Design a binder for this molecule. Structure first.
Ligand SMILES: Cc1cc(F)cc(C)c1Oc1ccc(C(C)(C)O)cc1-c1cn(C)c(=O)c2cc(-c3cnc(C4CCC4)[nH]3)oc12
Length: 108
């Protein structure tokens, strides 16, 4: 019986943020820098852990499921844009595994 959004900020996001593979997901995909003109046409709903952090810090979310959905969007965005077996995909898969472990200890 502890608050879920608190859990998401202090435990789930903290764990994922400190991970070795977090850096490409700590801010939006800069499509100009990387020269990716199709990224924002293909990806209708950009997401990254930076925005999720901002949202948790700034009372954006209606509930914990809306935040979980954003985490899931970030991962699937990455699997949609990139070929399977790309290194960015392997990094996301690792983050997703950890995400789902930490979620399965979520209070209620
Ligand atoms: C470009 C790149 C080279 C690497 F060796 C490793 C990574 C992770 C890598 O990806 C990124 C590096 C930096 C950044 C910054 C900091 C600018 O936001 C972003 C990525 C990156 C993050 N995410 C979530 C992505 O989905 C993709 C995708 C790509 C990418 C760049 N070029 C491609 C395709 C186009 C031909 C290869 N994909 O780069 C990123």
């Amino acid at each position: 019986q502890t608050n879920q959004l608190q859990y998401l900020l202090r435990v789930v996001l903290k764990t994922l943020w400190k991970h070795q593979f977090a850096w490409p997901f700590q801010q939006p995909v800069d499509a100009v820098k990387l020269n990716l003109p199709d990224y924002y046409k293909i990806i209708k709903t950009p997401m990254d852990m930076g925005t999720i952090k901002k949202r948790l810090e700034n009372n954006y979310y209606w509930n914990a499921q809306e935040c979980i959905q954003d985490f899931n969007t970030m991962f699937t965005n990455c699997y949609i844009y990139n070929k399977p077996g790309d290194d960015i995909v392997l990094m996301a898969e690792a983050l997703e595994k950890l995400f789902l472990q930490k979620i399965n200890e979520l209070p209620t």
